Amino acid sequence: SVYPKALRDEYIMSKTLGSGEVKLAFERKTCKKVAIKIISKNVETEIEILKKLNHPCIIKIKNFFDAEDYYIVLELMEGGELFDKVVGNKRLKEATCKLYFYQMLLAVQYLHENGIIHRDLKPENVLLSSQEEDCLIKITDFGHSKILTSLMRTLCGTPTYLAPEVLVSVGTAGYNRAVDCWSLGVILFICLSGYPPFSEHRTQVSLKDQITSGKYNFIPEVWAEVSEKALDLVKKLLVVDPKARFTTEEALRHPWLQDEDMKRKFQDLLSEENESTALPQ
Amino acid sequence: SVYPKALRDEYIMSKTLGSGEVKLAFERKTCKKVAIKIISKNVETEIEILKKLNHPCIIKIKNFFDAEDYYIVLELMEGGELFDKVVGNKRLKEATCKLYFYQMLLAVQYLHENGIIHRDLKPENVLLSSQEEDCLIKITDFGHSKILTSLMRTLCGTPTYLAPEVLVSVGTAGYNRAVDCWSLGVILFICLSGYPPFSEHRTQVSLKDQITSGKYNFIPEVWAEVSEKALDLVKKLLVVDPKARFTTEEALRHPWLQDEDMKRKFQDLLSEENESTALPQ
Numbered sequence: 001s002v003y004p005k006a007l008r009d010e011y012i013m014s015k016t017l018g019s020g021e022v023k024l025a026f027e028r029k030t031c032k033k034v035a036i037k038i039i040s041k042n043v044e045t046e047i048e049i050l051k052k053l054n055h056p057c058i059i060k061i062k063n064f065f066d067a068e069d070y071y072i073v074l075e076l077m078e079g080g081e082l083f084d085k086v087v088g089n090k091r092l093k094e095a096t097c098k099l100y101f102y103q104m105l106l107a108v109q110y111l112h113e114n115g116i117i118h119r120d121l122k123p124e125n126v127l128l129s130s131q132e133e134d135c136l137i138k139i140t141d142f143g144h145s146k147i148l149t150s151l152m153r154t155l156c157g158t159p160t161y162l163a164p165e166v167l168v169s170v171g172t173a174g175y176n177r178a179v180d181c182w183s184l185g186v187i188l189f190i191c192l193s194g195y196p197p198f199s200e201h202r203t204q205v206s207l208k209d210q211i212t213s214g215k216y217n218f219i220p221e222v223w224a225e226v227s228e229k230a231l232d233l234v235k236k237l238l239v240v241d242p243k244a245r246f247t248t249e250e251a252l253r254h255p256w257l258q259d260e261d262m263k264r265k266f267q268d269l270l271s272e273e274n275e276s277t278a279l280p281q
Numbered sequence: 282s283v284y285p286k287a288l289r290d291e292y293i294m295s296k297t298l299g300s301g302e303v304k305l306a307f308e309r310k311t312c313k314k315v316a317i318k319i320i321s322k323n324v325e326t327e328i329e330i331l332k333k334l335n336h337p338c339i340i341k342i343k344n345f346f347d348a349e350d351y352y353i354v355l356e357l358m359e360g361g362e363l364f365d366k367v368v369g370n371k372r373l374k375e376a377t378c379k380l381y382f383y384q385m386l387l388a389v390q391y392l393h394e395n396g397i398i399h400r401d402l403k404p405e406n407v408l409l410s411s412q413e414e415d416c417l418i419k420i421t422d423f424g425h426s427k428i429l430t431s432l433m434r435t436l437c438g439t440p441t442y443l444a445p446e447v448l449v450s451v452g453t454a455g456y457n458r459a460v461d462c463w464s465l466g467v468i469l470f471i472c473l474s475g476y477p478p479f480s481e482h483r484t485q486v487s488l489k490d491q492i493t494s495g496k497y498n499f500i501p502e503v504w505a506e507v508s509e510k511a512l513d514l515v516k517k518l519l520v521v522d523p524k525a526r527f528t529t530e531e532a533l534r535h536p537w538l539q540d541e542d543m544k545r546k547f548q549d550l551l552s553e554e555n556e557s558t559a560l561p562q
């Protein structure tokens with residue numbers, strides 16, 4: 001098939017960047033590069049979520065076409081997926097993991113403050129701004145995300161007719177956001193060590209049993225070169241009890257992220273990317 | 282304020298039947314009585330749910346007006362709420378409880394087969410067709426109801442990044458419908474005995490603690506006149522484990538409901554209410 005006419009009106013389509021499919025395109029009016037995500041036939045509400053979110057580590061949408069397929073136009077992240085930096089046991093310098101992880105926490109903290117849970121945080125969904133190692137990252141793919149009440153309404157009446165499982169669930173409600181902090185923990189683990197913590201490689205313990213017990217695969221030799229603070233943070237994110245698990249605020253206050261050099265590097269990358277109008281004093 | 286013009290066009294409004302508010306009205310075209318529920322400002326989707334459901338023990342919607350307030354036009358249930366038959370420790374003959382309860386089970390079975398959970402089953406929400414003791418009942422008020430998938434999508438990938446609480450919840454998912462069977466249990470308890478099983482009258486045990494332990498208030502003297510089969514069914518519905526609790530199918534197969542006299546009386550009331558066109562053989 002062809003591209004829809006309304007898209008072609010505004011953009012010149014070019015090469016595939018990844019595969020769902022992401023394409024390079026050029027905005028006709030500006031002659032600037034953009035990325036165009038094609039989702040074949042809540043994409044509707046992924047759009048609404050992304051329209052309303054405004055954070056430098058969250059992907060922004062420039063345009064949207066609902067045709068034979070869906071076309072989502074985004075700013076181009078030249079660096080590609082974080083995934084490609086961690087396959088084949090490739091490993092990032094610890095300093096680079098911190099820079100990237102700080103940005104992911106800031107992103108996910110912003111989501112949670114704004115009532116959004118992502119639910120599919122993984123290396124595939126973290127984009128890099130450039131091929132340089134020090135860069136901005138942006139979180140993408142809000143197709144599984146959830147907007148954070150039915151329990152609350154039930155509890156305003158007397159529970160004369162209310163089932164016991166509803167009352168038992170009051171203990172744990174309101175912690176759905178913690179699934180994102182677990183995923184972040186897993187991502188940090190992979191970045192620091194170049195391998196996944198839960199996996200069916202070697203071992204007879206099922207993947208499910210590894211995850212629900214929280215018994216991650218620790219290989220000392222791979223970790224010897226990783227600092228203790230780093231691994232400590234990983235341990236506080238991979239807590240099995242969602243109520244005890246570190247939140248993004250607690251992670252941002254952890255010793256490993258009290259690194260004014262890394263923060264400076266982040267601030268420097270931010271202002272480098274920004275094109276502001278004049279300011280009064 | 283006044284009634285909206287589009288309503289007045291079709292109906293002549295009359296007296297209050299109950300209080301939210303329910304009014305007697307007359308359809309101009311037929312000169313027949315109807316009931317009009319006024320909900321002041323998912324009423325939208327309560328309408329869609331009710332439009333698509335077709336069961337003789339579920340209230341049918343005749344019309345709907347979305348104005349200053351919402352107006353829902355329904356068939357008139359002259360008998361009023363089941364609530365009024367059980368306040369002040371009034372008690373229904375056991376035979377009448379069975380007739381009514383059979384109808385409630387049939388209704389709720391129909392909902393569950395069609396992917397609908399009611400979530401607010403109570404005497405207030407069961408309507409009687411007439412002031413006669415043997416009558417049809419209809420379940421109403423689908424304002425808290427839910428249409429029965431996010432878990433299922435999560436489980437089609439590998440759970441490398443998936444939080445342990447999601448995997449633990451696979452054990453219990455798909456049993457939300459059981460909240461309706463608990464409520465039915467509580468309603469049957471009230472109907473048979475004229476008092477509620479969980480209540481803050483006398484006792485120092487909190488309502489919550491009574492419900493989650495399943496320790497209903499049993500007063501032998503009130504129950505002596507109730508059959509053992511009846512109480513047995515109540516016990517199988519007020520099971521605290523939602524997976525072990527009786528479903529509507531299991532309740533319909535219980536000895537207490539194997540009563541061909543009651544069933545005949547129900548069939549007789551059905552055909553009495555129906556106005557069918559001629560039939561070929």
Ligand SMILES: C/C(=N\NC(=N)N)c1ccc(NC(=O)c2c[nH]c3ccccc23)cc1
Pocket residue numbers: 017018020022035037039043046059072074076077078079080081127140141142143144
């Ligand atoms: C919103 C979204 N998905 N939503 C959904 N699936 N429901 C989405 C997914 C991937 C990209 N990828 C990219 O920009 C790139 C991925 N690999 C790349 C390599 C080079 C440049 C850009 C990308 C951008 C947006």
Ligand SMILES: C/C(=N\NC(=N)N)c1ccc(NC(=O)c2c[nH]c3ccccc23)cc1
Pocket residue numbers: 298299301303316318320324327340353355357358359360361362408421422423424425
């Ligand atoms: C659909 C609904 N509510 N939905 C919602 N609240 N979201 C509804 C609630 C109550 C009635 N009541 C009745 O028909 C009567 C209640 N008491 C009566 C006494 C005499 C005759 C009729 C009724 C009918 C419909």
